[PDB]
């Protein structure tokens, strides 16, 4: 409603770097808010794409940002009569970024890995990896829970059970308030998908450079399965956390599986032991239900609600025809121990191929009326197809069915404006939560400042 679309702030990265593919707000040890920006195609040392991360100080004028430096060199360790190998070429460092406390977690989902032993090998595969930084101190650490040293022949004998070689850990990411990093790995267990969790403090204390393969004893991984419903489900394409079991001491995980059960798609709510508490099934095959998940209490009852995006949903129209527009589903959490029922509200896109629901950002309480609000992205929507972000306000019964405000992309065609979103943080300290919008196709980030309601 009250985001300012006149005076924006623009941050920009190098051409072709996909600057803005992922972003988050970052507060330093003094509470000063900055913007961490992932640029997964930034050039490295060998003039090759490896990705990169930028930490943008808040300025009304925006501009260029300094780099958050990470080691981009391939590593090799000859240990235990084996050869361990990391390959960072085209790893996509910055394909996801998230901030917690004064720590930044930037992940390279397509970092490859291999283990040689005489003439055998583990196979060169994208296990993925995440890089952790404490910018104020310069501390660095890594986390790559899907690296293994099992040779390829063994996986074939055991029918590729517990095969984490293609995890792409860090494809999605989230950090609990207690500081537990949760990684989505949609390629884990031969493309079933898995989740990897470990405390940030233990990642730092257990990591040493050059080891490549080390134990994080406090880590916890989800489980493989033989049920074909999960095969090729990309469980962990998207991840989020919240409180859904009524026990404030436990933190529940929200996991998107957009190709679950032969591309029907699903979203699941689990406890921290990966035991399933609820499952939301997709409405329409190939709609990619679960592409994005958001957790926020929208109706002001204190109970977290669930928003699921299906950006490829095809709406029914006249003369038995379908139109791909995308759809967002709102599930209100019921009072006490009860199952999440049918959706409380369906928001459906308008522009053909606009992909409404590709990203869903909690905004906090934007207009300061006591109800939290959301922004939904349609990165190829709007009458021109350049992209739109739509604000929906909370209310006592959930969300308004019509948007309070629509943000048209200020970038050219193909910018993918809205592909990444982040809100609920007051970056200019004016008492109103603001919105940052990534447009990786234009290698830029737009900052929308919230203003007093008019």
């Amino acid at each position, epitope marked *: 409603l009250n985001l300012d679309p006149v005076q924006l702030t623009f941050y920009a990265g190098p051409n072709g770097s996909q600057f803005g593919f992922s972003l988050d707000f970052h507060k330093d040890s003094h509470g000063r808010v900055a913007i961490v920006v992932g640029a997964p195609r930034t050039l490295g040392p060998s003039q090759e794409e490896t990705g990169g991360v930028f930490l943008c100080p808040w300025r009304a004028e925006g501009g260029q940002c300094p780099s958050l430096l990470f080691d981009l060199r391939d590593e090799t360790r000859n240990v235990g009569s084996q050869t361990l190998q990391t390959f960072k070429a085209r790893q996509g460092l910055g394909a996801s970024v998230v901030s917690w406390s004064d720590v930044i977690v930037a992940c390279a989902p397509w970092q490859h890995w291999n283990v040689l032993e005489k003439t055998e090998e583990a196979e060169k595969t994208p296990v993925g990896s995440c890089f952790l930084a404490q910018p104020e101190s310069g501390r660095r650490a890594e986390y790559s829970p899907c690296r293994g040293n099992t040779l390829s022949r*063994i996986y074939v004998e055991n029918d590729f059970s517990w095969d984490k070689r293609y995890c792409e850990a860090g494809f999605s990411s989230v950090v609990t308030q207690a500081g537990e990093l949760v990684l989505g790995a949609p390629g884990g267990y031969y493309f079933l998908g898995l989740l990897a969790q470990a405390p940030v403090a233990d990642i730092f204390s257990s990591y*040493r450079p050059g*080891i490549l*393969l*080390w134990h994080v004893s406090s880590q916890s991984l989800s489980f493989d399965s033989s049920n074909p419903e999960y095969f090729d489900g990309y469980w962990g394409y998207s991840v989020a956390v919240g409180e859904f079991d009524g026990d404030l001491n436990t933190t529940e995980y929200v996991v998107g599986a957009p190709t679950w059960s032969w591309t029907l798609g699903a979203v699941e709510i689990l406890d921290s032991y990966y035991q399933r508490l609820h499952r939301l099934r997709g409405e329409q095959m190939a709609s990619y239900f679960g592409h994005s998940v958001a957790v926020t209490d929208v109706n002001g009852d204190g109970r977290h609600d669930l928003l699921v995006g299906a950006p490829l949903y095809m709406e029914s129209r006249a003369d038995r025809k379908l139109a791909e527009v995308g759809r967002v589903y709102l599930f209100l959490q019921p009072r006490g121990p009860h199952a999440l029922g049918a959706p409380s509200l369906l928001l459906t896109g308008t522009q053909l191929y606009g992909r409404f629901g590709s990203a869903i950002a909690p905004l906090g309480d934007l207009d300061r009326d006591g109800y939290n609000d959301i922004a939904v992205a349609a990165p190829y929507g709007g009458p021109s197809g350049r992209g739109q972000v739509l604000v929906f306000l909370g209310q006592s019964e959930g969300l308004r069915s019509r948007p309070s405000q629509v943000l048209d992309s200020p970038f050219p065609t193909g910018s993918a404006f809205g592909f990444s979103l982040r809100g609920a943080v007051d970056i200019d300290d004016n008492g109103y939560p603001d919105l940052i919008v990534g447009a990786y196709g234009a290698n830029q980030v737009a900052v929308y400042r919230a203003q007093p309601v008019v």
Partner: antibody
Amino acid sequence: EVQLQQSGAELVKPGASVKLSCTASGFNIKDTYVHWVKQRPEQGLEWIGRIDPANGYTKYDPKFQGKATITADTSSNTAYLQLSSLTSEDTAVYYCVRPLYDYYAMDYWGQGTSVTVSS
Amino acid sequence: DILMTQSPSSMSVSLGDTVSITCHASQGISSNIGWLQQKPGKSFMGLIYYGTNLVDGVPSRFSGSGSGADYSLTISSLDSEDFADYYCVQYAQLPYTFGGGTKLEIKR
């Protein structure tokens, strides 16, 4: 806290067999590699082999191929070292070892099991 | 197998001294070396892994260094508890092999 609690001292005869145990305390035995090391006052320290209790795969020094048999039971959280066709030279102290962080390291050690082979 | 020649076999030193134990391999092992301590009539405690990294709980007066095939364990300002046996172990190749050992003894 990580602790490796081994079985008590064994007193056996030559030609017989013995099976030592190494129980994990404060952690899951399935987490890391578990090695077995032999110590004698003259010959010093010698590496017998290792086991991954998650799957049972083992590696051995070719010197101990035949006498040493390493196994593990994730249920009882225990790893074992079986010695067969015992000889006076098998009289030694045996330690079970696991790493701290590095997959291939040798950081945590049990208190050791004393073995004496005699008629 | 990789031969681990550890030197010296023993040394007579006093409290507060800065001593250094060395370990030479028969081939390069690229810091894939650990250092161990065995107090008199007791089990083993890990000191160093991967050449330089202190095991959790080990005092900072211990330190490891070296590269290629030559490594060292150094103890700055010896404590009364530091008088014990010390061994190096390589894990660059299976089978793992240990150094001969080094016994720190009280000088008088």
